[PDB]
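Record type: ASSEMBLY
Status: queued
Input:
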Amino acid sequence: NPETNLLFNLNSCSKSKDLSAALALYDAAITSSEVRLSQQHFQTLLYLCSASITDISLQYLAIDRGFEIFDRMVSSGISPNEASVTSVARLAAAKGNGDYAFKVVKEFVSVGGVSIPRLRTYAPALLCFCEKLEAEKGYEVEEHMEAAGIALEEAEISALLKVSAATGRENKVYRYLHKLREYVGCVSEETLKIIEEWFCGEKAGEVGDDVGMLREAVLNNGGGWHGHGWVGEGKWTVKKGNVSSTGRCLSCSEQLACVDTNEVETQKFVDSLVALAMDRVVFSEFQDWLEKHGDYEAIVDGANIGLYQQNFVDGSFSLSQLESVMKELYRESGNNKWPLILLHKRRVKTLLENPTHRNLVEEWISNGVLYATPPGSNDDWYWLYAAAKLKCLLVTNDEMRDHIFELLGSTFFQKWKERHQVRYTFVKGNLKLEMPSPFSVVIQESEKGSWHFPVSCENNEESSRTWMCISRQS
Ligand SMILES: [Zn+2]
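Status: finished
Output:
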């Protein structure tokens, strides 16, 4: 059987990255006319041609003979899959042909059946245009990506920022300094140098505008950014320097913002939370109970605080620790609001039928500062909902890492936990609440057009992270 032998030998070439050998077998199949060409033969060759772009000894062969393999695949009556289109997009981008790398994807997305065009399909085009300082054709790829419903990562956004800085398009540079802020957060060392080069450059110091109305724009957006135009005269003062624990940069000596988590994104969180919670008993009775009587500054994971530093074997529970968390949050509250504790019905009873505790537990149920979550369903979803919907603190020592709560948007979560979650500790006797930080680690604009960029300390992120401060002085 010749078809199985060709597929077996082409795979043996792909294991060694031996393009020369597989590309010889490709000729033997065509000229002899003994073997039936098929999708898996064409695919194996195209991936190998894309794989060989990095190899110096095999790149010239892949670029010369790669497109003929793709053209034979289409004319044989086989539509090209996502990986095959990406392979030719990379091959075309390797020899500076951005327009073919673009239009090979436009044909693919135009079918729209089972295409599924990933970012790696469009990236060969986009990067090739930004390499050749073709800003206009670069931005076309972004439009066709964003319309096709594909997220841009840091590398693509940095490429578009780079080409904007090269062509001197100060409108577009401002666009992508907010795309990084929005879709990335803290930036790379390479990405930081792309930004540093702009603000140090002469074009950046030829832009300007007001004071009063921008304050509303900062508040309405969240706190991080005002989001329209540059502010100042010229000559930026770029410098790297660390930030305080209180949210105060040592370079410029101004206040960093603690940005509110996205209001529309928080509504997607709570709806997906109620959707999973409504699953066999009535969850909706808590929803209205919170809304009717619930204006607390903090929520407490009752099961966590009580079982903290207790033996899993003994089944020992600690109301005294849960009592301490109640009193300290009440003190730290300015208006003096007691937090809402959320325990199970199995844990509230047994606490209630202990005569020592009964009074204190009954007191909290009467005052509306403790809610019993019903059996069967988890308490997990009740205190997530309570803190998230009311937008307040959540006291628990539990970084929620699991595949049951996998609908957690890990982009939105962590970013939510850093703003809202309160950790704690009981050193022998006394309690110590570890509050969330008074400033967020994200890109942000001041009212005076002063930017701040945090660089991602990938190894050991701490208070000694370097921030790249950029201000005007006017
Ligand atoms: Zn600063």
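Annotation: The domain at 1-260+436-474 is CATH 1.25.40.10 (Serine Threonine Protein Phosphatase 5, Tetratricopeptide repeat).
Annotation: Residues 249, 251-252, 254, 452, 469 surround zinc ion (CB under 6 Å).
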